[PDB]
Ligand binder design. Structure first.
Ligand code: A1CGC
Ligand code: A1CGC
Lengths: 520, 524
């Protein structure tokens, strides 16, 4: 079975799979063509990412597809041997790989073999690390041996290993996105018998923070729930088919292990969902979309584009949603960071993660909360080339207390005010909020927008929530009394919600923001 | 085979240091008669250091090949990967072999792997090998012509006992190449690549900032990869492959140099024409930073030691840094641009030592206010400056925007005796700045800089740059919008764009601030 694993049996990493394919397969199938022009093939590739992804099979998939020899060195297995056994085994591994070429050597759990030098506390451990380094540098330029390694964090690996010529290409196999999750769910359910009511797309969309292993466990739990419901009360053996109810139940009881891991992807929020102003949209377009869309114009006119902006205004979800929408427009990855998250050298880490994604929209929320971290952010921004397509966006609700250093040119040089949404914006927001709900025909959104003025996006969302709570309360009470009288939200529900206006922004705050704008 | 042919030409990015090493090694190892006659003691330990990838690992081999001497290589990890007695036997066997075949050169690559700081060593085998190395080092009789060269990332990671007066007394830094060095490296690596006729490596080298030799090798590889990707994916092809300037630019776009955070030492390419500047300030800086270095004889004749430090205070902007870079450029002295934020994040002495190593240096300290009036850094800097021999051609320049806050200690004589002020640029300065800003971009013949300068008064360097930047964005905006309509209409930036940018003409420096600076000057 192992030799039969291919590209199709790995899900959740298709971009990285293409990268690895071009890096490895092509040289190992037409070495003459690459040598002619003079392209040097890579000699060390380090895959890293959260545990549970498919990065342990990537090496096997590549080796099988390229039809090359494959050798596996298991970190814990090597470190579980006597003093000389580990050295003999590393040497034998590399020698065997050289014997049969082209080859691939996968050193699973490298951080087990070569942890940070501080962690090591014996002569045997350091001797093994140095043995690995010596073997690594000994790969002749034409040996046709590619060393692949996997870890959780490259920082846990001995830095000497991450030098030129030893491990110079580092690829991240991160959390899958919705398409990746669907791919994994379709891979794992190959043998399970499904019912006709299963729509894996919804499951994939709803499974947040799930890695391939988590999805395998989820499928197993759903099958078990089906067994429980059926057998509890050969005929049955042939009448078993997991149902969407079982999958939803399994989702309910699941505890994904990758909840806290930052997510990088292209969000699915469009302009229509926030509405927003026109000037702000135009400015954001000019800043972010044009340089990526038409770099030629910037080059010919020869002025380097600015990197980041700094939204200010009353609190709410407009700023974050606006940034997400602009990122969606340009099809660039979106990275969200919260001040509380940062308070808990991570700054360099997140900046490098952004730099890895070519079009990225690095978002920093609650920037006001953020001396050491401030200086680290300052230096990192100052040391960001204004020619790489990485855009920093800030957000704050107290521009007065923001340190002026960040505002200095080259770091964050543009300020944009985000006012309360207007009538059209409020209409768009309300339409988005009730998008997934069965609203009644009588209800008109335009009148609601006219009635509500000065209400922040939070206020409108709260208004929608109050109405739905009323509908649920009515349905339950009617159901109890009856024991679909309330099939859709009615006007009375919305009016009852409106009974408590609760405007979250005072006119004094708006005047203060206006004064801040005028002073600029 | 190929190893024994590496020479001076096959190393790039280090030409000053290569000349130093040539004089310091090749000549003694070819004409010992003269050196012994006049009585010059050849060095016995040379420690090369710098960021990884710079090609210092070939310097030893290049020198050995050129001088025709025996060459022996000891690889740190290789020695430390053996059993307890194997590493000792190997060090001893290396030095014995080198001495047996004289003259020789011994290159101990990755010294810090063999002899780290005493504290970092926990076992006894590690300390035993370090002591073995020290014993062998001291055992080199002056008569025997053995020169030990070692390479390490930083000299501090090496055991201090090694950096003694008879072991490793010469330390050479091989740091990031400059633009000429980058061009040299690119020429070396593209020897076997077949390039197209539109490739002009000068622009690549100039734009490749923070790249080391290895990074440039990767860049060339990626460009070739892009070319093959496009053409092939879309024997004839094998003979039609030629990298193109588009491929090199694309490779640059997607490259992540590993030496971005490393301080750069180099003569800046900024001239007086790009800053304008008051004639008084220009003359004063000329005197201070040029007469001592250009006519030391006169200073000796009148016997007054030149002051070392100058301060700059005034409105925030690009003026101070540009002025310092210009004065450095005129004297062709190296420029070090330590910023305050970098220092906020031992280090002070390291910067001062780096400056000292480059004799004519224009060490720059921006935003000094943040560091000074904290206690630790300010005291360390005061101590280090006070220990700065005024007879050396190292000039310290400070910049600040709160001249009222800096502690008076820094301005006491012997530390920073001059207190020049940098005021807002005048009309001619603004004209020069605008000409420089638009120099790289096409401009309409109608557009006149003189009127724009006349309109702009009190505008800081950023203000002028902002004006130019805003105008270009308008031109790009208009240029593209026409393109979609047609789907060149805007070949150059027209005066309409400049006037539209001028519509929102803003002054970033309040006249109150300028008056405050004037008050400080008068009180001073
Ligand atoms: C939306 C985020 C959101 O609603 N954020 C938010 C709501 C209310 C807030 O009040 C404050 C505040 C702070 C200090 C003083 C007073 N009030 N901050 C608030 C923030 C959202 C984000 C991302 N995706 C979707 C929605
Ligand atoms: C130019 C650098 C430059 O213009 N930097 C700069 C612009 C504006 C600034 O405002 C402050 C400041 C300080 C304190 C309070 C308020 N504002 N600092 C500023 C710095 C330049 C540098 C290097 N090479 C070329 C040009």
């Amino acid at each position: 079975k192992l030799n039969e694993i291919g590209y199709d049996d790995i899900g959740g990493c298709r971009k990285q799979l293409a990268q690895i394919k071009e890096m490895v397969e092509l040289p190992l199938r037409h070495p003459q063509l690459f040598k002619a022009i003079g392209v040097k093939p890579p000699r060390g590739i380090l895959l890293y990412g959260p545990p549970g992804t498919g990065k342990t099979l990537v090496a096997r998939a590549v080796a099988n597809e390229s039809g090359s020899f494959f050798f596996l060195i298991n970190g814990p297995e090597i470190m579980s041997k006597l003093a000389g056994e580990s050295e003999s085994n590393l040497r034998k591994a590399f020698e065997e790989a050289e014997k049969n070429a082209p080859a691939i050597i996968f050193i699973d759990e490298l951080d087990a073999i070569a942890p940070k030098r501080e962690k090591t506390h014996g002569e045997v451990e350091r001797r093994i690390v140095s043995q690995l380094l010596t073997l690594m540098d000994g790969l002749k330029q034409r040996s046709h041996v590619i060393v692949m390694a996997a870890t959780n964090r490259p920082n846990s690996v001995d830095p000497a290993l991450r030098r030129f010529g030893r491990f110079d290409r580092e690829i991240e196999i991160g959390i899958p996105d919705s398409i990746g999750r669907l791919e994994i769910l379709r891979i794992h359910t190959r043998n399970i018998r499904l019912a006709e009511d299963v729509e894996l797309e919804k499951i994939a969309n709803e499974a947040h923070g799930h890695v391939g292993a988590d999805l395998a466990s989820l499928c197993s739990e759903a099958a078990l729930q089906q067994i429980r419901n059926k057998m509890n009360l050969a005929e049955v053996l042939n009448s078993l088919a997991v149902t969407m109810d079982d999958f939803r139940w399994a989702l309910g009881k699941s505890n994904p292990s990758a909840l806290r891991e930052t997510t990088v992807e292209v969000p699915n929020v469009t302009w229509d969902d926030i509405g927003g102003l026109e000037n702000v949209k135009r400015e954001l377009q000019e800043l972010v979309q044009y340089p990526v869309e038409h770099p030629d114009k910037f080059l010919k006119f020869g002025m380097t584009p600015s990197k980041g902006v700094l939204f200010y205004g009353p609190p709410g979800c407009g700023k974050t949603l606006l940034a997400k929408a602009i990122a969606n427009e340009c099809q660039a990855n979106f990275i969200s960071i919260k001040g509380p998250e940062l308070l808990t050298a991570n700054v360099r880490d997140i900046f490098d993660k952004a730099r890895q994604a070519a079009p990225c929209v690095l978002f920093f929320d609650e920037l006001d909360s953020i001396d050491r971290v401030i200086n680290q952010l300052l230096t990192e921004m100052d040391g960001m080339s204004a020619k790489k397509n990485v855009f920093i966006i800030g957000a704050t609700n107290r521009p007065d207390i923001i340190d002026g250093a960040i505002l200095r040119p080259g770091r964050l040089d543009q300020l944009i005010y985000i006012p309360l949404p207007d009538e059209a914006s409020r209409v768009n927001i309300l339409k988005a909020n009730l998008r997934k709900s069965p609203i009644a025909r009588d209800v008109d959104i335009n009148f609601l927008a006219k009635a509500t003025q000065g209400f922040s996006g939070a206020d409108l969302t709260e208004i929608c929530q109050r109405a739905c709570k009323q509908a649920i309360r009515e349905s339950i009470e009617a159901e109890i009394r009856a024991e679909d009288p309330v099939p859709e939200i009615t006007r009375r529900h919305f009016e009852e919600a409106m009974r408590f206006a609760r405007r979250s922004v005072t006119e004094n705050d708006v005047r203060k923001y206006e004064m801040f704008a005028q002073t600029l």
